[PDB]
Design a protein around this ligand. Structure first.
Ligand SMILES: *[C@H]1O[C@H](CO)[C@@H](O[C@@H]2O[C@H](CO)[C@@H](O)[C@H](O)[C@H]2NC(C)=O)[C@H](O)[C@H]1NC(C)=O
Ligand SMILES: *[C@H]1O[C@H](CO)[C@@H](O[C@@H]2O[C@H](CO)[C@@H](O)[C@H](O)[C@H]2NC(C)=O)[C@H](O)[C@H]1NC(C)=O
Ligand SMILES: [Cu+2]
Ligand SMILES: [Cu+2]
Lengths: 644, 644
C-alpha cells in the first residue's frame, strides 16, 4: 500500500504473496507483518466487527486448521471450509491495509492450497480487488499443470544449478490410445479456464458474501455442455467416435495413468481399465448416486422439483433449467439438498478414489478431485456426457419453436463469408518451473523453464452480408454456432442429430442500419475467447515498474477472463479438411437485452442476453423445414484445415 | 592397480567405479581410461582372444545396447543379455589391468543397471575378485531400497544444500492392513540377501562361465521355502493367518501401492485389489502358466521329467528335487525348457505388468520384476506359497523315515537349553542417500542420510548337553529348527502340520567327545546368518587408508555372505510371548560330510552336508511316535518375547 491503493501496489502486493509459495516469504515487509500483525486488534477494518477473523483465529489457535506443506483438494469438506474461512476475512476488509495484513499473517501459517485458493477467489470476488491481474496458476503452482517428468527435470536443474527449458510430452502411449485427443484436455489454457470458471461462480457461494451470481445454474448447464461438445468435436477430427455416457452399473471401460505428481503428496493414483466402481468410504456409496440420479430424473420427468416441505416448485418454464442446475451440480441455490443431494460434485470425489476406496494405501486424492486437473482423466468427459443428457432430458421436453417463433421480421441474412482461412496448427509455449523447485537461501535462482505444445488457428474474418428491410435501425443479437455435418460413420446427421453437438464461436450485439449493411468481424473479437495471459514474471516486471514511477497498470485485459483460449476457438480437424456447417442466426437485440463486465458477471452483474442458452439450437428441431424459413437464420458450409 | 593386485587397490578401484553412478566419473584415471582404452587391441589379456569383448563392441558399435539413464529390470530378455555381455568380458580378464580398463571403458557408455548388475556378478564369480567386499546396494542405488518420500526429501536437501537425515516410514495405512508384517519385507537386509542369493546362484548361469554351482536346484527349492516360512511366522506374531497360495484362476485378492520410485523411470505402478489377472502382452498368456503348471505337476506326479527326446529322466530319488528346481525356476540346468518353460520367472514378470498388460500407459516394470524389490509387494509371498507346495508335492511322496532311519546310535541329546533370553525389539539404522541426488560440478556435496527402523533380537546361547555312548569321538551334524506350536486359531498342530513351517536357525559340524559333553553355541556364530555390512563410505575410508600405507584390508568377513540378517535370526513374536518348539536333531557327521566357503559355494565349491535339505523335517511324519524315539533328536519348548 500507499496506506491504500495504487494497483501497481495492490498488484505488487499480490505478486509478492504468491511468489515462492512452498516456502516462508522472502519479502521482509510481508514478514514483519507476518509477525507483528494481530487480526484481532482493531475490529474496525472489518465490516464484520471481525467475526470472520475471530473465527479463523479460533481455529488457528486450537490449531485445528490443515497443516502446511501437505496436499489439498477443494473437494475436502474440511479443507474447503478452512480455505473458505480465509476468503471471509480478506472479504470483509475495508481496505488494502486489512488485506495485505491478513494475506501475510495467514499466508505464513495456513496451508498453501487453502492459501492459494483463498487468495484467488478473494481477489476475484471482493470489492477490493479491482486493479489486479492474477499470475497464471500454471506458473505459481506448476505441479498441477506440468508433467511428472518435466518436474523431475526441473528438480535436477535446481540440484545442480544449471538451467534450462524442458519439452513436455503428452500422456499415454500415443499411438496406442485416445491420448490422441490429449492436446485438448491437457492444455494449460483449458485447464486454466476450467478452474477459473468455477472460482468465478463457485458451487459454495451464499448470497451473504455480497451479491448473487446471476444464472449460475444455466451457467453451469452450459459451460459443461460446451466442454462436452468441444471435446466431442476433437474426437471427430481424430477418427474417434463421440463419447460414451458413464453409468453406475457398468465397468469404467476407459482408464488412464496421469503421470502427474503433487508438490507435497506423492504421485496421482492411476486407474486400471475395465474396472468396477467401488463404494468409496467416506464419500458415498455407489448406489447413493444411482438413487440421487433418480430423484433427479423424476424432477425432470414430473414437471416439478419438490423442496423440503413438500412444496412442488415448478420447472416447466424458463427459470427451469437453472433450478435444475442448482440441484444437479449441487450448489447452495438447491431447493432441497437433503433429497437431491449432489450428483456432480460427489461424482468427482467418487471417481477419484477409485484408486483406493477403503483407503488401504493412503494414495492422495486423484486427478478428478481437482479443477486444474480433471480434464486430464478420460472419464472426465464420460462423467459430463452423463450430466450432459440429464439436462438434455429437460431441455428437450419443450415443444419445438414455431416459425413465428424465430423470425425477427425485417432483418435477413443475405450471405455469410469467411474472410481468410480456417487453419489450425501446433504452436509452442513456455511457462516457468520456478515456483516448483525449492531454493532456500543464499543459494541463488537458476531459471528453469517448461515448453509445451499447444493448438492454434489463424485469425480470420466474418463477412456477414445483410439487409434490414425494416424502416430503420434495429438492435441485433449476432449468434454464431459451428455444428458438424457427417458421423465418423460417414452418416450425415440432422440438426437434431446435430443441433446438440454444436459449439458456440461468438455472440455479440450490433446495430443494424436501415439497409443492406455487410458486417465483418474477427477471430480476435470473439466473445467466448480469452488471450493467453501475461507471464508471472512479466506481471512482476510491470508491477514493479509503476511503483518506482508513479502510476497505472492498465492491462485491464485480464481482470476476469471467463472464456476459453483463443487458440481453442475452432476445432483441430483433419489435414485433408472437413467441412463444418456455420450457423449465424440473428435474433432481436431489443428483446434480448430487454433489460441490461456482463460477460463474466463475476460480481453480481446480470447476464445481458435473456434468450435461454444455446438459442435457438437448444430445442428439439424435428423438421428442419423450419429453421430454414425464418429470414434471420442462414447456414453456410465452411472447411477447416490442419497444418502439419 | 600396482600393475596388478593389492586388494586395498582392487577394492579401491571398485569403490571408485560404483561412486556417483548416475553421472560420468569424477576420478580422472577412470576417465583417461575411459577415453583412451580399446578393448580390442591386445586380445591377450582376454582368455577368449576376446570374443567376448569383440561382441560387446559390436553392439556398442551398431549402438544397439540399452541407453544410459533409463531403467532396467533383469527380467528383460534383452537388457539381461546386454548386462550379461559385460559379465563375459570382465570374466575373461587375466588380470586387474583388463578389469579396471573395461569396467571404466564400459561404465562410461553402457547403461547403469546393466553396469551395476554386471560389475557385481562379475566381482562375485570371476577368479579375479577375491579380496573385495561390495558396497551395499542400498547405498549405491538408493532408489531401489528407500521410499519415495525420503527420496524426495533427499532431493530437496540437495536443491538447497542443507543436509540431514530423514526417518523413513513403512508402507500402507498401517492400522488398516497387513502392512503390519511390513518390517519383514521391507528391510534393507532381506532385500539385500534376496538379491545376493540370486547373484550367487543365478538362473542364467551356464557352466561355460567356469565351474558349476552345485545344487542350485535344491538351493532354489530351499531358499524360498525359507523366506516363505520365515514370512509365515511373522504373520503369526501379528494375529495374521498363514498366507493364501496364489492361483491363476482367482482374483489376486490382496493388492498394494508401493510408494517407491525408480531413479530414471517414474513411480512403481500400483495394483488395485480384488483384480483379475490379465494376459500380459509380450510376456505370456495367463493360460500359458496354467499349462506350464500342469506339465510341472505331471512330472511330480509321474515319477519322471521327460526331456526333448522323450527320454524319461527319473526323479523319484535324491537328485530328485534339484532336477525339479531346474525345471521350475527355470534355470539353464532345465532338461526340457521348451516344454516345462519357466513358471517362476515368468510368474515374476507376469505379476508385474498387472499394472499395464497391453501397455497402454507405458508404466515401468514393477516391484516384483526385480530382486531388490519384490519382497515388498504382498503377492510376492502368495506367489512363493504356490511355488512352495509344487515342491512339497514331490517332497512328500517319499515314504516316511524309519526309526532305524534317523538314529545315530551312540549319541544322545540329554538336554537343551537357552542361555539368555529370547528378546526381540526394534533398533535403528542409517544408510546414505547420496548416490541418489545428482551433484554435478563445482557444486559441493552435502551429506544426506536415511534412517530406518529395523528388527532385532539379543545374543543368546545354546547349551546342548549330551552324551556320546559310543566308544569314542564321533563327528556330528548339529541341526537346529524352531517350528511353531499352535494355530492362530489356537489349534495346536502336529509336526506334520508343523514340520513344514519351521525355519532353520543353525546347522554346524562339531566333534563329540567320548562322554557327556555340554556344547554351548551362539546367536552370533549361526550358519544362516550374516552381519549388517560395512558402510559404503567406511569401505572407502578403509580402502584408501591401505593404499597410502602399504597393505591389507582383511575384513574377510564379507566376501560372499549368503545368509539373512542376524537381526532376523528369530521371529518377532508377541509382547506377551509365544512358546515356539526348538528341535535339535543331531545326525552323523561322517556320513553327512561323507565327502567334503562351502556355505556360499559361490565359486564351484561342493555344498558339504549331503543330507537333503530340511533334514530330517522334509518328510511326511505321520506318527510323531517316531521322531520321538531316536536318541539323537530332542525337542524343548522356548519362549520369545517382544520388547516394545
Ligand atoms: C523439444 O522440441 C523443441 C522444439 O521447440 C526442440 O528445440 C529445438 O532444438 C533443436 C536441436 O535439434 C533445434 O534445431 C530447434 O531450432 C529447436 N527449437 C527451439 C524451434 O529450441 C528440442 O530439440 C526438443 N528436445 C529437446 C530432445 O529440447
Ligand atoms: C524420526 O524418529 C527419530 C528416532 O530416531 C527421531 O529422532 C529423534 O529426535 C527427537 C526430537 O523429538 C529426540 O528427542 C530423539 O533424541 C531423536 N533421536 C535420534 C533416539 O535423532 C525423530 O524425531 C523422528 N522425526 C524426525 C518428525 O527426525
Ligand atoms: Cu527369489
Ligand atoms: Cu522368486
Amino acid at each position: 500500500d500507499a496506506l491504500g491503493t495504487g494497483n501497481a501496489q495492490k498488484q505488487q502486493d499480490i505478486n509478492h504473496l504468491l511468489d515462492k509459495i512452498y516456502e516462508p516469504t522472502k519479502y521482509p515487509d510481508l514478514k514483519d507483518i507476518a509477525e507483528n500483525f494481530n487480526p484481532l486488534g482493531d475490529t474496525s477494518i472489518y465490516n464484520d466487527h471481525g467475526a470472520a477473523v475471530e473465527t479463523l483465529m479460533k481455529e488457528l489457535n486450537d490449531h485445528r486448521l490443515l497443516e502446511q506443506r501437505h496436499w489439498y483438494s477443494l473437494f475436502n469438506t474440511r479443507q474447503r471450509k478452512e480455505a473458505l474461512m480465509l476468503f471471509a476475512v480478506l472479504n470483509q476488509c475495508k481496505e488494502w491495509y486489512c488485506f495485505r495484513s491478513n494475506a501475510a499473517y495467514f499466508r505464513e501459517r495456513m496451508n498453501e492450497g487453502e492459501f492459494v485458493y483463498a487468495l484467488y477467489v478473494s481477489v476475484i470476488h471482493s470489492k477490493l480487488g479491482d486493479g489486479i491481474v492474477l499470475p497464471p496458476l500454471y506458473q505459481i503452482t506448476p505441479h498441477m499443470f506440468t508433467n511428472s517428468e518435466v518436474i523431475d527435470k526441473a528438480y535436477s536443474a535446481k540440484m545442480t544449478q544449471k538451467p534450462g527449458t524442458f519439452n513436455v510430452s503428452f500422456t499415454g502411449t500415443k499411438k496406442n490410445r485416445e491420448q490422441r485427443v490429449a492436446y485438448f484436455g491437457e492444455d494449460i489454457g483449458m485447464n486454466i479456464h476450467h478452474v477459473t470458471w468455477h472460482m468465478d461462480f463457485p458451487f459454495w457461494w451464499e448470497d451473504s458474501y455480497g451479491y448473487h451470481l446471476d444464472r449460475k445454474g444455466e451457467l453451469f448447464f452450459w459451460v459443461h455442455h460446451q466442454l462436452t461438445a468441444r471435446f466431442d468435436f476433437e474426437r471427430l477430427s481424430n477418427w474417434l467416435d463421440p463419447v460414451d455416457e458413464l453409468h453406475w452399473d457398468r465397468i469404467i471401460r476407459e482408464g488412464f495413468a496421469p503421470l502427474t505428481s503433487y508438490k507435497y503428496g506423492g504421485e496421482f493414483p492411476v486407474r486400471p481399465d475395465n474396472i468396477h466402481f467401488e463404494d468409496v468410504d467416506g464419500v458415498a456409496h455407489v448406489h447413493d448416486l444411482e438413487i440421487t440420479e433418480s430423484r433427479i430424473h423424476e424432477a425432470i420427468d414430473h414437471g416439478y422439483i419438490t423442496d423440503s416441505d413438500g412444496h412442488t416448485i415448478d420447472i416447466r418454464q424458463p427459470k427451469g433449467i437453472e433450478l435444475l442446475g442448482d440441484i444437479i451440480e449441487s450448489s447452495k441455490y438447491s431447493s432441497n439438498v437433503q433429497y437431491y443431494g449432489s450428483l456432480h460434485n460427489t461424482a468427482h470425489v467418487m471417481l477419484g478414489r477409485q484408486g483406493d476406496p477403503h483407503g488401504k494405501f493412503n494414495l492422495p486424492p486423484g486427478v478428478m478431485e481437482h479443477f486444474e486437473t480433471a480434464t486430464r482423466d478420460p472419464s472426465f468427459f464420460r462423467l459430463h456426457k452423463y450430466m450432459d443428457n440429464i439436462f438434455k432430458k429437460h431441455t428437450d421436453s419443450f415443444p419445438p419453436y414455431t416459425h413465428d417463433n424465430l423470425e425477427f421480421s425485417g432483418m435477413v441474412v443475405n450471405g455469410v463469408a469467411i474472410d481468410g482461412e480456417l487453419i489450425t496448427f501446433f504452436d509452442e509455449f513456455q511457462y516457468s518451473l520456478i515456483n516448483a523447485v525449492d531454493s532456500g537461501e543464499n543459494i541463488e535462482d537458476v531459471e528453469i523453464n517448461a515448453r509445451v505444445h499447444r493448438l492454434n488457428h489463424n485469425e480470420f474474418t466474418y463477412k456477414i452480408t445483410m439487409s434490414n428491410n425494416n424502416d430503420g435501425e434495429r438492435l441485433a443479437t449476432f449468434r454464431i454456432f459451428l455444428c458438424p455435418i457427417e458421423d465418423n460413420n460417414g452418416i450425415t446427421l440432422t440438426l437434431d442429430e446435430a443441433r446438440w453437438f454444436c459449439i458456440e464461436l461468438d455472440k455479440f450485439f450490433q446495430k443494424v442500419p436501415s439497409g443492406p449493411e455487410t458486417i465483418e468481424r474477427s477471430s480476435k473479437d470473439s466473445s467466448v475467447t480469452v488471450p493467453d495471459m501475461p507471464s508471472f514474471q512479466s506481471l512482476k516486471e510491470q508491477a514493479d515498474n509503476a511503483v518506482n514511477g508513479g502510476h497505472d497498470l492498465d492491462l485491464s485485459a485480464y481482470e476476469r477472463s471467463c472464456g476459453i483460449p483463443d487458440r481453442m476457438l475452432l476445432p483441430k480437424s483433419k489435414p485433408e479438411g472437413m467441412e463444418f456447417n456455420l450457423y449465424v442466426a440473428v435474433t432481436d437485440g431489443d428483446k434480448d437485452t430487454e433489460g441490461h463486465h456482463a460477460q463474466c458477471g463475476v460480481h453480481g452483474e446480470a447476464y445481458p442476453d435473456n434468450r435461454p442458452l444455446g438459442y435457438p439450437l437448444e430445442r428439439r428441431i424435428p423438421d428442419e423445414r423450419v429453421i430454414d424459413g425464418v429470414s434471420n437464420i442462414k447456414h453456410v458450409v465452411v472447411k477447416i484445415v490442419h497444418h502439419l
